[PDB]
Chains A and B, each alone.
With several copies, the nearest count.
Chain A
Amino acid sequence: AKKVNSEFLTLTYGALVTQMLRDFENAEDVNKQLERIGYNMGMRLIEDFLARTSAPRCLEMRETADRIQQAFRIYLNIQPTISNWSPASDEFSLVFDSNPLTEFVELPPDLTNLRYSAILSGCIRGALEMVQLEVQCWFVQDQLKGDNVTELRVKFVRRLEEVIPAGED
């Protein structure tokens, strides 16, 4: 029954963001720790995303893109769209349509340096850590910032696994 309301989680997250900003005036630290907790969630979250689909780690990067894409539909019940691949064809752009945590939560223009929902941008980080595929991942257009629809840019950097599943570590 989805056992949650988008509003409910939105309230919890907004209150938490309020809490950090009340803790540290500088948005730099709130961004740091929010990406830290995004990493933290993304490590355990993949343990459930792989509890349903037993996809092989990475045959190709488009497989990773579709995996992370379906992840949000599993959790946040939104379908992102993958596009804008390089001639190198390793990176990509990913579109989040509607963000439950965002829904009518305005941000102070005196707080612009904050990356509000970057937890997801870090969750995939924490996710991509686990499968031994670290990634330079972040946003190029933010529906939060005033852009039309959310758009995160994924630059994969390097692998951590050999012909054995154990891989380098």
Chain B
Amino acid sequence: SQSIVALLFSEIVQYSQSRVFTVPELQTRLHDLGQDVGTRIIDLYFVRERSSKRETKLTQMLLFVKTTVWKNLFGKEAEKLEHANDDERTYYIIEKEPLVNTFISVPKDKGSLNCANFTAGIVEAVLTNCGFPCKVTAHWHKGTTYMVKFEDFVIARDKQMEEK
């Protein structure tokens, strides 16, 4: 079903709002929960979709996550995965479908960020357990996008591997 998950998740969000007295670390709680779910989402979806195969290439693993996590979680794989050439540590994954607004959400006057942050935390946990620790920020740029910021160590290991 959809109503059960959409609601029940909404009570996670608002009960955090109960235990939280402000916007930003409310969003931090949403991130932490996204992490705590992705921390197993990762290696569940590993076997059943990746055929139990590891992708050392950041591009390939990131693209495959983009397909898989969205295909099974919210059906539609995210529209586009892009790498910014100015900052190789910072890439983007734009998902025009808002997973927060699947359950049409609160006015963003009293607040800014939403379940977008929760799925961003999912992405961040997937990255950090795939051996690619990263910072994933939900951004209302061109609709819903997740900016991913790679550790200079991780992107450096990548660049060294990208020396064929």
Q: Which residues of A contact B (CB under 8 A)?
A: 1-5, 7-9, 11-13, 15-16, 18-19, 23, 33, 37, 40-41, 44-45, 48, 74-77
Q: Is the pair A12, B37 in contact by a Cβ cutoff of 8 Å?
A: yes
Q: Shortest beta-carbon distance, A24 to chain B, in Å? A: 10
Q: Is the pair A15, B36 in contact by a Cβ cutoff of 8 Å?
A: yes
Q: Please, which residues of chain A bring their CB within 8 A of the CB of B47?
A: none
Q: Shortest beta-carbon distance, A43 to chain B, in Å? A: 10
Given A1-B75, A37-B11, residue A9 in contact with residue B36 (CB < 8 A): no
Instruction: State in angstroms the CA–CA spacing of A18 and B5 once bound together.
Output: 17
Given A8-B72, A23-B19, residue A41 in contact with residue B36 (CB < 8 A): no
Q: Is the pair A9, B5 in contact by a Cβ cutoff of 8 Å?
A: yes
Q: Is the pair B1, A74 in contact by a Cβ cutoff of 8 Å?
A: yes
Q: Is the pair A16, B12 in contact by a Cβ cutoff of 8 Å?
A: yes
Q: Shortest beta-carbon distance, B119 to chain A, in Å? A: 11
Cβ contacts A to B, 14 pairs, < 8 Å: A4-B4, A5-B73, A8-B37, A12-B12, A15-B36, A15-B37, A16-B12, A16-B33, A19-B36, A33-B15, A44-B7, A74-B1, A75-B3, A76-B4
Closest 9 CB pairs of A and B: A15-B36, A75-B1, A37-B11, A11-B37, A75-B4, A3-B2, A48-B3, A16-B12, A4-B5
Instruction: State in angstroms the CA–CA spacing of A74 and B33 once bound together.
Output: 27
Q: Please, which residues of chain B bring their CB within 8 A of the CB of A18?
A: 36
Q: Which of B1, B12, B36 has the most CB of A within 10 A?
A: B1
Q: Shortest beta-carbon distance, B41 to chain A, in Å? A: 7
Contact of B9 among A3, A12, A19, A48 (CB under 8 A): A12
Q: Please, which residues of chain A bring their CB within 8 A of the CB of B72?
A: 5, 8
Across the interface, name the chain B residue whose C-beta is closest to A74: B1
Contact of B5 among A1, A8, A15 (CB under 8 A): A8
Given A1-B75, A3-B75, A4-B1, residue A41 in contact with residue B15 (CB < 8 A): no
Q: Please, which residues of chain A bring their CB within 8 A of the CB of B12?
A: 12, 16, 19
Q: Is the pair B1, A76 in contact by a Cβ cutoff of 8 Å?
A: yes
Q: Is the pair A8, B1 in contact by a Cβ cutoff of 8 Å?
A: no
Instruction: State in angstroms the CA–CA spacing of A1 and B2 once bound together.
Output: 10
What string of 1s and 0s marks CB contacts (under 8 Å) between B28-66 and chain A?
A: 000001001100110010000000000000000000000
Q: Which of B2, B8, B72, B74 has the most CB of A within 10 A?
A: B8
What string of 1s and 0s marks CB contacts (under 8 Å) between B94-122 and chain A?
A: 00000000000000000000000000000
Q: Please, which residues of chain B bring their CB within 8 A of the CB of A33?
A: 15
Q: Please, which residues of chain A bring their CB within 8 A of the CB of B4?
A: 4, 9, 41, 45, 75-76
Contact of A11 among B1, B3, B7, B40 (CB under 8 A): B40
